[PDB]
Amino acid sequence: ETSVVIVGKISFCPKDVLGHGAEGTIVYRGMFDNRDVAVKRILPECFSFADREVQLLRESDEHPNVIRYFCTEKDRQFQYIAIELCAATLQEYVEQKDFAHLGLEPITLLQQTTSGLAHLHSLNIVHRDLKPHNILISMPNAHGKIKAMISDFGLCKKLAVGRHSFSRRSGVPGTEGWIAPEMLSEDCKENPTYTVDIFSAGCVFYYVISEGSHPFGKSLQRQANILLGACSLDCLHPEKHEDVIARELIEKMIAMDPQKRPSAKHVLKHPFFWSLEKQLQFFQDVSDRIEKESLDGPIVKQLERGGRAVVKMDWRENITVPLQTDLTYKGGSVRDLLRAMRNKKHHYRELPAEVRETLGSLPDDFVCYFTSRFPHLLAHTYRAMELCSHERLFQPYYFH
Amino acid sequence: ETSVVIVGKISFCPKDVLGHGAEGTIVYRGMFDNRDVAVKRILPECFSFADREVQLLRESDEHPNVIRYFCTEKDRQFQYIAIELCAATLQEYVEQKDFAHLGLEPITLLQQTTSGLAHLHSLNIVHRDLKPHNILISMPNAHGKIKAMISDFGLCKKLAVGRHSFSRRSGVPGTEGWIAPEMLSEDCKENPTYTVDIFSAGCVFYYVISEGSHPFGKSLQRQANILLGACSLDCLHPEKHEDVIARELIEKMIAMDPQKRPSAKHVLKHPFFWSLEKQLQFFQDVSDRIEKESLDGPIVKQLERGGRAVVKMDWRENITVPLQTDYKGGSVRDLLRAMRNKKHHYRELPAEVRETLGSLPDDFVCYFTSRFPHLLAHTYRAMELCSHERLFQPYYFH
Ligand SMILES: Cc1ccc2c(NS(=O)(=O)c3ccccc3Cl)cccc2c1Oc1ncccc1-c1ccnc(N[C@H]2CCCNC2)n1
Ligand SMILES: Cc1ccc2c(NS(=O)(=O)c3ccccc3Cl)cccc2c1Oc1ncccc1-c1ccnc(N[C@H]2CCCNC2)n1
Numbered sequence: 116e117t118s119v120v121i122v123g124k125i126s127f128c129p130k131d132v133l134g135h136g137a138e139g140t141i142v143y144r145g146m147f148d149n150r151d152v153a154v155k156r157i158l159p160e161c162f163s164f165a166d167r168e169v170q171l172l173r174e175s176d177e178h179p180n181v182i183r184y185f186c187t188e189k190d191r192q193f194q195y196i197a198i199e200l201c202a203a204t205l206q207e208y209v210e211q212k213d214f215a216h217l218g219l220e221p222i223t224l225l226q227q228t229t230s231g232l233a234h235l236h237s238l239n240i241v242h243r244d245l246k247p248h249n250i251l252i253s254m255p256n257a258h259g260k261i262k263a264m265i266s267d268f269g270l271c272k273k274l275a276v277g278r279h280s281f282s283r284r285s286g287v288p289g290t291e292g293w294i295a296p297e298m299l300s301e302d303c304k305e306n307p308t309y310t311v312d313i314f315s316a317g318c319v320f321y322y323v324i325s326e327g328s329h330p331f332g333k334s335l336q337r338q339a340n341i342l343l344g345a346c347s348l349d350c351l352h353p354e355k356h357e358d359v360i361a362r363e364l365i366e367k368m369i370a371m372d373p374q375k376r377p378s379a380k381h382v383l384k385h386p387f388f389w390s391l392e393k394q395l396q397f398f399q400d401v402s403d404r405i406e407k408e409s410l411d412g413p414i415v416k417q418l419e420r421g422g423r424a425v426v427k428m429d430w431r432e433n434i435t436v437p438l439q440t441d442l443t444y445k446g447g448s449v450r451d452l453l454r455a456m457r458n459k460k461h462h463y464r465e466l467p468a469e470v471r472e473t474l475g476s477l478p479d480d481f482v483c484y485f486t487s488r489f490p491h492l493l494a495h496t497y498r499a500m501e502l503c504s505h506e507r508l509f510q511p512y513y514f515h
Numbered sequence: 516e517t518s519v520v521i522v523g524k525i526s527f528c529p530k531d532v533l534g535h536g537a538e539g540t541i542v543y544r545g546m547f548d549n550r551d552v553a554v555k556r557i558l559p560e561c562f563s564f565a566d567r568e569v570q571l572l573r574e575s576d577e578h579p580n581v582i583r584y585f586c587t588e589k590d591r592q593f594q595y596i597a598i599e600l601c602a603a604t605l606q607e608y609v610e611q612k613d614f615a616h617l618g619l620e621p622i623t624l625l626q627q628t629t630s631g632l633a634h635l636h637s638l639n640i641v642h643r644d645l646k647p648h649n650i651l652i653s654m655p656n657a658h659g660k661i662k663a664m665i666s667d668f669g670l671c672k673k674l675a676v677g678r679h680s681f682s683r684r685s686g687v688p689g690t691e692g693w694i695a696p697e698m699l700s701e702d703c704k705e706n707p708t709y710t711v712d713i714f715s716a717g718c719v720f721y722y723v724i725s726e727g728s729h730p731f732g733k734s735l736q737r738q739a740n741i742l743l744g745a746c747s748l749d750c751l752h753p754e755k756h757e758d759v760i761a762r763e764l765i766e767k768m769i770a771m772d773p774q775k776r777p778s779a780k781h782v783l784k785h786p787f788f789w790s791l792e793k794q795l796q797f798f799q800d801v802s803d804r805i806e807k808e809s810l811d812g813p814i815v816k817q818l819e820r821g822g823r824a825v826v827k828m829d830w831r832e833n834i835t836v837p838l839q840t841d842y843k844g845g846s847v848r849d850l851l852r853a854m855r856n857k858k859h860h861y862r863e864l865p866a867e868v869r870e871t872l873g874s875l876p877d878d879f880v881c882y883f884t885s886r887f888p889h890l891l892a893h894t895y896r897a898m899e900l901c902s903h904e905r906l907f908q909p910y911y912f913h
Contacts (some may be wrong), residue, residue, distance in 0.1 A: 123523075148587075149573060150573070173548070173550070176656040176657050179579075187548075237657075237658075238657060257575075257576050257637075257638060258637075407863050461803070464807060465807060476905065477905065477906060478905075507874070507875065507876075508876075
């Protein structure tokens with residue numbers, strides 16, 4: 116327990132176990148090329164399997180958010196794979212880190228996870244075992260930035276060219292509590308495909324922003340709840356703007372019907388990942404698009420459907436008194452709510468002093484003024500203006 | 516000759532020479548981990564130097580556009596460094612490739628080169644030897660996409676913490692023809708710094724977009740011309756929008772006075788790299804910023820200075836007649852107001868007018884930039900007055 120194993124360019128002390136894999140697989144902290152590495156040791160029974168994994172990584176385009184091996188070695192008794200030593204798994208990050216001052220970092224790790232996934236899917240690889248345990252969080256670089264990396268390719272499937280799904284077998288479907296329902300359900304009439312990864316990631320999304328919860332309950336009940344379709348996201352409050360949008364995305368990602376789940380590239384286009392500037396730009400593009408638009412036309416009809424709850428009966432009554440004074444719009448209309456936001460954005464410099472003060476700076480404070488008071492505004496408008504998905508001017512906002 | 520050298524995980528046939536470095540250095544094609552690699556072989560007198568180069572890269576953050584070593588090996592007689600086998604140097608790219616169908620790819624290679632350089636600078640590294648020959652172009656990935664990678668760190672300098680320049684010595688300044696004037700000039704009263712790389716890079720930009728020319732002339736006259744400040748960019752035509760924009764950036768990058776050259780991060784914000792869509796959004800934001808501005812005010816006065824040449828004396832007389840159907844023609848500001856207005860009311864204005872303009876945003880902005888090739892460049896420079904306002908953050912590097 117004080118020895119150092121040396122195999123080619125990889126060395127480690129066996130006492131420094133970082134974790135355990137399946138079939139007698141152990142991961143150690145060791146060293147390579149004067150760097151810290153994690154080293155997976157492989158038993159003879161798994162040599163061919165480990166080789167196939169390495170080869171899949173060897174052949175595939177690299178991506179910053181997909182783990183990359185540093186070195187492989189082999190002696191008489193074992194094979195070894197070294198990867199970069201990371202700070203934490205996503206599980207440990209969620210369990211241990213105070214989110215209070217991390218700002219958007221946890222969200223960027225989900226965005227980075229979705230990019231790694233989109234990369235895999237674009238290579239016709241389905242992961243099938245996405246979970247917080249095997250999403251790895253790097254050490255900070257020179258400017259304090261960290262990144263998420265997908266690992267653990269032991270269950271992945273590279274689909275043949277021209278193949279878009281895989282059929283169910285008796286064997287290993289994933290990790291209990293993270294397995295999409297079409298892997299286990301009884302009356303499933305469609306092959307599993309890339310979207311099993313989106314279900315898992317949906318669960319991962321909620322796990323991160325709820326800091327430890329899971330849409331399908333505590334671990335002992337999860338997989339059973341998944342088959343029943345019994346999910347709950349009550350860590351997301353219906354009157355908080357950021358929560359309404361996260362819920363909007365996560366509900367689609369974990370949909371029981373795989374065909375209703377967005378693809379990874381779709382997910383990446385969602386308002387969840389929008390800056391405040393882009394949120395405001397969306398509101399302005401929408402408002403520009405829907406003026407001259409008829410009042411009984413399908414678009415503004417879609418927008419005003421259930422809009423009373425969105426504007427809170429009368430949005431004229433739910434803004435500060437400076438803006439109230441400086442405003443003849445229709446208070447039960449979301450279109451006119453949007454019209455008023457664009458108008459005041461446009462003439463922002465002409466606004467009286469007390470008004471620019473109550474609104475805040477452009478764009479961040481300005482848009483927060485409205486999203487914080489009307490928490491359903493973005494999500495409602497995002498879904499309503501999906502009628503214009505195809506239109507070129509709405510390309511930045513939806514995935515075509 | 517027909518043998519294979521095997522050193523640890525690296526192997527190669529010595530017949531497969533890809534090139535020669537300095538001091539007996541040779542680069543071969545070979546193999547590593549079942550991949551194609553380029554293998555540099557280093558002689559004993561360069562062991563320590565090569566070790567320092569590798570160490571610099573081992574410690575420094577990686578970046579998609581800075582070369583990464585795959586492997587290092589060492590026997591009794593040599594040391595070896597393997598990197599990824601690339602398709603070409605930027606020199607070979609420019610010399611061999613037909614640009615006619617490459618679209619924006621060559622510009623994209625410049626942008627990735629600048630991102631590599633920005634990354635190096637943010638790690639307080641000065642490269643000091645940027646040139647087409649050591650900018651490498653990757654093989655295509657699965658989607659046919661390629662990238663540029665900066666290599667050759669033999670002259671680089673990592674400046675100590677809280678140090679921003681390096682002083683001149685009698686020794687190696689770089690590669691003749693790509694050496695910034697302040698490395699060799701007579702009455703230079705300021706230390707060289709990061710911007711020696713911006714000077715080289717500016718020469719590289721022109722080399723790519725001119726497909727083989729150099730701002731300071733043919734190979735034998737270049738460095739002498741750099742000393743004189745005698746440069747020419749006449750592959751770039753004064754009445755072509757794209758050429759005007761490239762000229763605006765490149766002239767700054769190769770400025771004799773280093774303090775007038777943009778940092779790599781400034782470079783990356785320049786309209787040279789802007790999509791047609793972003794060019795339009797710029798014209799709209801500019802229009803919005805100045806709509807209430809005073810005519811005598813320092814902002815629109817800046818914009819109207821030299822304005823007549825930009826709008827061709829009268830811009831109303833230089834557009835198509837279906838647009839002339841529906842301002843002050845000697846004013847840049849009114850040209851921009853007209854553009855913003857027509858974009859804003861694009862849906863509700865007649866069909867034949869929408870036809871001559873073209874679809875939004877690409878064809879619409881090109882209607883005006885093709886007819887007023889100095890409009891963007893002029894406006895970008897003038898509106899640098901608002902470059903620290905949050906609203907113009909997308910357009911200028913703060
Ligand atoms: C999860 C995972 C999955 C697959 C791995 C794997 N297999 S693979 O499918 O990803 C693969 C990758 C490349 C080539 C082949 C293969 Cl099979 C190989 C190696 C490691 C793998 C791996 O890594 C680990 N597995 C178990 C425990 C720990 C780590 C680990 C890795 C890096 N850093 C850290 N840091 C510690 C520091 C203390 C605090 N906690 C974090 N821990
Ligand atoms: C330029 C350069 C600079 C520095 C190198 C270098 N040193 S370094 O300073 O970049 C460095 C990098 C990492 C670690 C240490 C060091 Cl010293 C090491 C290895 C190669 C280096 C290198 O590479 C070469 N040098 C000379 C000739 C050819 C290549 C080369 C490299 C990859 N692909 C191809 N493809 C051919 C295929 C046919 C068509 N033409 C392109 N050619």
